[PDB]
Ligand binder design. Structure first.
Ligand code: 6IX
Ligand SMILES: *[C@@H]1O[C@H](CO)[C@@H](O[C@@H]2O[C@H](CO)[C@@H](O)[C@H](O[C@@H]3O[C@H](CO)[C@@H](O)[C@H](O)[C@@H]3O)[C@H]2NC(C)=O)[C@H](O)[C@H]1NC(C)=O
Ligand SMILES: *[C@@H]1O[C@H](CO)[C@@H](O[C@@H]2O[C@H](CO)[C@@H](O[C@@H]3O[C@H](CO)[C@@H](O)[C@H](O)[C@@H]3O)[C@H](O)[C@H]2NC(C)=O)[C@H](O)[C@H]1NC(C)=O
Ligand SMILES: *[C@@H]1O[C@H](CO)[C@@H](O[C@@H]2O[C@H](CO)[C@@H](O[C@@H]3O[C@H](CO)[C@@H](O)[C@H](O)[C@@H]3O)[C@H](O)[C@H]2NC(C)=O)[C@H](O)[C@H]1NC(C)=O
Ligand code: R16
Ligand code: R16
Ligand code: NAG
Ligand code: NAG
Ligand code: NAG
Ligand code: NAG
Ligand code: NAG
Ligand code: NAG
Ligand code: NAG
Ligand code: NAG
Ligand code: CA
Lengths: 49, 49, 49, 930
């Protein structure tokens, strides 16, 4: 839960077979980090999708 | 809704969760996923439709 | 559309769970699949059937 | 066969050798001294390494910037490609030059130590980078240790941050970068690290199977309990309880049982078979836990009492249960909040505080592996505070090495954090160990300190744990121990399961565990090597404790094996005229020669392809004189003496005759290694092991002072029985100075047709069968039984087999093989416990008659045991009668489950636990509930 920690690799048990995946510090698709991004996020919320 | 491998966030366990789930079904978005969960909870398609 | 969502293409006679959550067909216009798989009967269907 | 000719040849050359005694007492004392010297050498290496690790971590300065000062190290999971772009910001990677070494069998670099960092651990964080910085002194002391003792195998620092730094730099096994080969190795789960990180436990896993744990929580709880059990050694005692308004055992065990492979499997099955239902009650569960930890009627390790609570959360603290049962705070309580939920986690975190424990969270699979290592991190606080009384070398059970070397035992020593010491500071985390240092001792390295070739092929050494497991035994194979029916554990094979179990052997095992010394001569059922016969042996066990360790060494020695022939070959020409017989160009006057692939000289490499080894042996014999200290003279002297005697037999008695109608092959096998089979035609049909000490018939024919016929294998794809024959052998029994010593076996491979014609020749003067020991049809008359020659007679007509057993002419012993490969069924090949049986002559009587009461019919038989052999003739006259073929007596290595563990823990085998253990210190700071 920090960008310092979120480096290297990790074991993913999602596939039901262990697989090593990279650790990526990502941002969500609709993310409110601006009044232009918040407008788009709120528009997509208002359309219901 | 305590399924194997997962527990949905849109569940009817407590009152805040139930009230939010009913609100989300009212707005119309993804009511079908909650329907599938509520059918699988009452036994399989076999006996809970 | 009766009973058309039940042919999923399964591994090579291993009797394991089918690969992919989509119906298939052994015919020409339907969705073929790939990777040593056989489009055979008895898959409950999409969305738990 | 010419027993007499080989005999009088042997007495004809008393001036060519000397007969020497096998004083078993001195042999055991010498081997025990050698083994204690080896283990003390490894202990000294460990002490050096641990001292330097503590000193060099005491003088370390913490940092957060490694860009300005890179750390240079070799990462084990680096690809051999010269990739300049495979470096972390704070670390520059070494690219080593790898040579191939004989000791290790892998690429080995002596110039630096390698490092293993688990995939789930980032290899450039601050903790990892600091550890990689201060372990370079460990690298240097690795070099020094290997420089003072060139026989060292892997010597390793198992860091508590996840790292592992072993000295001979070798690439990780198969898991560097390979699809479907994921690297789940973690040093802190390894048996040697688990062993050296703390003292033996008394767990009791309380699983909270109530209603609120259904779904994902129960999945994570059962996986977590499995992974918790996978961190318990054989010195640890554990039971698993489960409570939902009522506490009960999850399995058939009613108390704390030892945490060995079988019991751990039983507990794992019980936990996997568990279901969630009902209301929680934290008082009736902890009452059960504290009551089961108050049981002292059962065997235990009276140390480190623990309770592992696998719940999710709740609003119940149960203060009064703890104040009643745990008031002196003798019992820890580690609480685990498993699952992804929003229940209250306050009482869960409080039970750990008021009971010296710790609180762990397991939100999802992937968090399971780390928290078990972490309670073990907690348990080592009392060990740290005991400064130098806790630094003692301990050796683990026999296990299979990671960097594949075969079977090894690791000697561990923990490393203490000593930053603030004699200059006392806050000493925040000075209660945790830095890691554990281990050094591996190869089991084949222990085998070389117990020379076996001066003994009979029936005499051998074996060592033992305090738990009774064998450090060293002829029946210990490099395979994992089977635990049930197939559908990184240690190789823990008990002494009573590596052999046949009498009561005298239980007395001997108990005496060895206690560390006493003594001798015992008695009569033993010795199972043959092919696991198909049982002979009535004559043994003499002598044992001593190995001083300075927990091991106890013993030497099995047959009564006739008290003397051995010492070859007096010092003429340098007589050995040459013996040697000239061995090139594979004279295999027409002398027999087809095979040589035991022994360690005659180190420059010879043993080969599975025997004639290759024969060629190099001849080559080295061609120029042998300058290689005086290169190798042992005794082995080559004896093998050449035996080759000469065998040649004198094969020319002066076999080459004068050249042909007998009945025989198909004439062979002689000698303890030196010579096994010349005469015709050179059946030598292609010869399928016996080149090493004579592993020849089943040779070992069988020495205890049995008579003729032994080995029935060929049935339905085996190869040379078969018709075109090879059937084996016949008797052992020479020469006397020198009035002493009984048996140096060799001669034999005949009698042809099947030349016997069947003579057997049916006299029929004018149909059902007639010949049976040997073990009830195998050697040959018959009906000519359809002879189709199934060598096959077990019980498979032919099992009714007569059962009845003939009922007269008690054939006794049988059913035992277990825990190290056998196994075809997996349904609910490549896994390993199971196979349940092999062997038959033999119950009584010594010679004539047997009776009536077979077949169902609604009657059958008559007469049995006569041929004098001076292991055969019985059965005259039964009944074919195609009413069907009494209900079942079969299948003498075969049958897949089975082992002995019922729920019944074997109520009368457990005697076992001596570790003496000193560290728990419940008063200086320990409990205010770290996490
Ligand atoms: C109810 C229907 C008859 C008409 C209804 C509609 O079509 N909604 C969409 C879903 C939706 C919702 C919000 C959207 O963002 C525009 C917005 C945002 C906030 C408030 C008002 C408008 C876009 C799409 C729908 O699901 N349509 C189906 C036919 C049922 C499939 N819109 C709202 C009428 C409308 C649209 C645009 C405007 C202007 C702003 C003046 C241009 C004015 C009026
Ligand atoms: C079935 O076939 C022949 C039957 O003639 C068996 O060989 C004979 O065995 C008898 C046993 O008592 C011998 O007397 C026969 O002659 C012996 O030959 C040896 C050869 O070294 C002499 O030293 C003896 O003094 C004696 O004369 C012997 N004859 C032959 C030709 O072998 C044969 O053993 C038997 N088959 C099997 C498999 O045993
Ligand atoms: C062995 O014990 C010593 C001390 O008992 C450990 O050294 C100490 O480690 C802590 C980190 O847990 C250091 O605190 C850190 O300091 C840096 C810089 O001041 C700061 O940026 C961090 O936020 C954190 O506060 C501490 O300085 C360091 N030294 C002392 C004297 O306390 C050591 O880590 C232990 N060994 C291992 C292998 O962890
Ligand atoms: C393995 O094979 C050996 C073959 O000797 C078996 O040992 C024999 O077992 C029988 C059956 O229990 C013993 O007979 C019993 O003798 C006692 C004492 O006289 C008598 O009271 C009983 O009524 C019964 O007749 C026999 O003595 C014993 N042999 C020896 C030398 O002690 C053994 O049972 C087989 N199985 C195992 C697991 O070892
Ligand atoms: C780095 C900042 C760039 C942000 C551009 C994002 C595009 C957002 C489009 C906004 C759409 C608004 C719809 C609702 C208007 C009332
Ligand atoms: C397993 C297949 C057959 C199971 C029996 C039929 C169950 C489906 C019928 C119920 C559907 C409920 C929705 C009705 C909406 C009008
Ligand atoms: C082990 O020590 C005991 C007593 O210290 C001694 O009697 C015995 O000979 C020793 N054994 C060896 C192999 O040194
Ligand atoms: C122990 O080490 C010494 C020198 O360090 C060596 O001479 C001796 O042979 C070693 N012992 C064994 C059993 O290898
Ligand atoms: C730790 O790092 C510093 C700077 O790179 C280096 O001088 C020092 O030798 C390192 N410690 C050890 C034990 O090598
Ligand atoms: C163990 O498994 C069997 C078979 O699934 C089941 O019938 C039994 O109830 C299980 N044990 C418990 C205690 O539930
Ligand atoms: C142990 O044995 C004693 C006496 O044999 C008995 O009273 C007690 O119930 C047994 N069990 C425990 C747990 O003490
Ligand atoms: C060994 O065998 C001899 C005869 O073969 C027998 O008299 C003796 O009792 C046996 N040894 C033991 C310990 O019984
Ligand atoms: C064994 O080695 C010899 C000598 O090189 C060779 O002729 C023979 O083919 C080899 N046999 C096998 C099975 O490798
Ligand atoms: C032999 O068979 C009888 C009945 O068929 C049985 O009672 C007995 O146990 C068997 N074994 C012996 C050694 O008598
Ligand atoms: Ca509950």
């Amino acid at each position: 839960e920090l960008e310092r920690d979120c480096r290297g690799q990790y074991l993913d048990y999602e596939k039901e077979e262990v697989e090593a995946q990279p650790r990526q510090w990502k941002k969500y698709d609709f993310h409110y980090d601006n009044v232009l991004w918040a407008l788009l996020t709120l528009f997509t919320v208002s359309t219901g999708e | 809704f305590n399924f194997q491998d997962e527990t949905p966030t849109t569940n009817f366990d407590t009152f805040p969760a139930a009230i939010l789930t009913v609100f989300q079904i009212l707005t119309g978005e993804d009511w079908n996923a909650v329907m599938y969960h509520g059918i699988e909870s009452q036994g399989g398609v076999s006996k809970g439709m | 559309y009766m009973g058309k969502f039940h042919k999923a293409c399964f591994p090579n006679s291993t009797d394991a769970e089918p690969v992919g959550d989509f119906p298939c067909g052994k015919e020409a216009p339907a969705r073929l699949c790939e990777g040593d798989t056989e489009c055979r009967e008895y898959w409950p269907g999409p969305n738990f059937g | 066969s010419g027993v007499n000719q080989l005999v009088d040849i042997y007495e004809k050359y008393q001036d060519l050798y000397t007969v020497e005694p096998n004083n078993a007492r001195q042999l055991v004392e010498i081997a025990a001294r050698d083994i204690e010297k080896l283990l003390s050498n490894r202990s000294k290496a460990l002490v050096r390494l641990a001292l330097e690790a503590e000193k060099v971590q005491a003088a370390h300065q913490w940092r957060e910037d490694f860009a300005s000062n890179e750390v240079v190290y070799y990462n084990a999971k680096d690809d051999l490609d010269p990739e300049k772009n495979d470096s972390e910001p704070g670390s520059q990677r070494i690219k080593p030059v790898f040579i191939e070494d004989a000791n290790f069998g892998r690429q080995i670099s002596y110039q630096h130590a390698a490092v293993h960092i688990p995939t789930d651990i980032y290899e450039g964080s601050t903790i990892v980078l600091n550890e990689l910085n201060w372990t370079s002194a460990l690298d240097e002391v690795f070099k020094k240790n290997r420089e003072e003792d060139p026989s060292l195998l892997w010597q390793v620092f198992g860091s508590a941050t996840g790292l592992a730094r072993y000295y001979p730099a070798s690439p990780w096994v198969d898991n560097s970068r390979t699809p479907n080969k994921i690297d789940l190795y973690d040093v802190r789960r390894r048996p040697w690290y688990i062993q050296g990180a703390a003292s033996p436990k008394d767990m009791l896993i309380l699983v909270d199977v109530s209603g609120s744990v259904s779904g994902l929580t129960l999945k994570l709880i059962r996986t977590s309990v499995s992974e918790m059990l996978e961190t318990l050694s054989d010195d640890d005692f554990v039971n698993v309880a489960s409570f939902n308004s009522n506490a009960q055992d999850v399995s058939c065990f009613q108390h704390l049982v030892q945490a060995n492979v079988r019991n751990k499997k039983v507990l794992k099955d019980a936990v996997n078979n568990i279901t969630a239902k009902g209301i929680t009650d934290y008082k009736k569960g902890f009452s059960f836990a504290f009551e089961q930890l108050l049981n002292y009627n059962v065997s235990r390790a009276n140390c480190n009492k623990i309770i592992m609570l696998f719940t999710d959360g709740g609003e119940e603290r149960a203060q009064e249960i703890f104040n009643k049962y745990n008031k002196d705070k003798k019992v820890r309580v580690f609480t685990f909040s498993v699952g992804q939920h929003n229940y209250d986690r306050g009482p869960i975190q409080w039970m750990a505080c008021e009971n010296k424990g710790y609180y762990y969270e397991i939100p999802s699979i992937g968090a399971i592996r780390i928290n078990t290592q972490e309670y073990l991190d907690v348990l080592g606080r009392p060990m740290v505070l005991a400064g130098d009384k806790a630094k003692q070398v301990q050796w683990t059970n026999v296990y299979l090495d990671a960097l594949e070397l075969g079977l090894v035992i690791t000697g561990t020593l923990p490393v203490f954090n000593i930053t603030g010491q004699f200059e006392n500071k806050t000493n925040l985390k000075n209660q945790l160990i830095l890691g554990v240092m281990g050094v591996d001792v190869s089991l084949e390295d222990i085998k070389r300190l117990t020379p076996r070739f001066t003994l009979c092929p029936n005499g051998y050494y074996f060592a033992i744990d305090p738990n009774g497991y064998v450090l060293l035994h002829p029946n210990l194979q490099p395979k994992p121990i089977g635990v049930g029916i197939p559908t990184q554990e240690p190789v823990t094979l008990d002494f009573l399961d590596a052999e046949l179990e009498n009561d005298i052997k239980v007395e001997i095992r108990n005496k060895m565990i206690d560390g006493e010394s003594g001798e015992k001569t008695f009569r033993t059922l010795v199972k043959s090597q092919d696991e198909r016969y049982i002979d009535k042996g004559n043994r003499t066990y002598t044992w001593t404790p190995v001083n300075g360790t927990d091991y106890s060494l013993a030497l099995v020695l047959p009564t006739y094996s008290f003397y051995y022939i010492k070859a007096k070959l010092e003429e340098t020409i007589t050995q040459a005229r013996y040697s000239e017989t061995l090139k594979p160009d004279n295999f027409e006057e002398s027999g087809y020669t095979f040589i035991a692939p022994r360690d005659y000289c180190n420059d010879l490499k043993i080969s599975d392809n025997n004639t290759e080894f024969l060629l190099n042996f001849n080559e080295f014999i061609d120029r042998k004189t300058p290689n005086n200290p290169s190798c042992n003279a005794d082995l080559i002297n004896r093998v050449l003496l035996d080759a000469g005697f065998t040649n004198e037999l094969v020319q002066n008695y076999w080459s004068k005759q050249k042909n007998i109608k009945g025989v198909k092959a004439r062979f002689v096998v000698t303890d030196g290694g010579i096994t010349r089979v005469y015709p050179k035609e059946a030598g292609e049909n010869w399928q016996e092991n080149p090493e004579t000490y592993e020849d089943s018939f040779y070992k069988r024919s020495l205890d049995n002072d008579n003729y032994v016929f080995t029935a060929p294998y049935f339905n085996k794809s190869g040379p078969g029985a018709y075109e090879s024959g059937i084996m016949v052998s008797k052992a020479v029994e020469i006397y020198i100075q009035g002493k009984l010593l048996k140096p060799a076996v001669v034999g005949i491979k009698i042809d099947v047709n030349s016997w069947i014609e003579n057997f049916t020749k006299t029929s004018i003067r149909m059902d007639c069968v010949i049976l040997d020991d073990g009830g195998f049809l050697l040959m018959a008359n009906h000519d359809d039984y002879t189709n199934q020659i060598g096959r077990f007679f019980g498979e032919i007509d099992p009714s007569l087999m059962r009845h003939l057993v009922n007269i008690s002419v054939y006794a049988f012993n059913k035992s277990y093989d825990y190290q056998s490969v196994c075809e997996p069924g349904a609910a490549s090949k896994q390993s199971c416990i196979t349940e092999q049986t062997q038959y033999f002559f119950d009584n010594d009587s010679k004539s047997f008659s009776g009536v077979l009461d077949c169902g609604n019919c009657s059958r008559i038989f007469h049995g006569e045991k041929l004098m001076n052999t292991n055969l019985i003739f059965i005259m039964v006259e009944s074919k195609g009668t009413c069907p009494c073929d209900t079942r079969l007596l299948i003498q075969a290595e049958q897949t089975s489950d082992g002995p019922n563990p729920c019944d074997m823990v109520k009368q457990p085998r005697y076992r001596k636990g570790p003496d000193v253990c560290f728990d419940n210190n008063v200086l320990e700071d409990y205010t770290d509930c996490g």
